[PDB]
Amino acid sequence: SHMPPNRPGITFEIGARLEALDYLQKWYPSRIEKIDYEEGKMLVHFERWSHRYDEWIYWDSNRLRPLER
Ligand SMILES: CN1CC=C(c2ccc(O)cc2)CC1
Prior knowledge:
By secondary structure, the chain is mainly β. The protein has one domain (1-69). Helices cover 0% and strands 39% of the residues. The protein contains no helices and five strands. The termini are far apart. 4-(1-methyl-3,6-dihydro-2H-pyridin-4-yl)phenol binds next to loops. The site of 4-(1-methyl-3,6-dihydro-2H-pyridin-4-yl)phenol has 6 residues, from loops. Is a negative regulator of proteasomal degradation of a set of methylated proteins, including DNMT1 and SOX2. Involved in the maintainance of embryonic stem cells pluripotency, through the regulation of SOX2 levels. Residues 10-69 form the Tudor domain.
């Protein structure tokens, strides 16, 4: 088990915020809910929405983008 590779503007830690594309192809402010280090993916929670919408997204996915800062 190894750490997620570095990506600009994203911190791969629980509770860290970012923006993510949901399955309906729209971007939302989101937070990292869980990290699966073996599979290289994380469970993304879309802020304001039910946790039933949380999605597993691989840590290298272009469905993730950092917040503009
Ligand atoms: C993170 N995604 C946000 C919005 C969702 C949604 C919006 C409208 C609708 O009819 C059905 C689903 C899905 C979860």
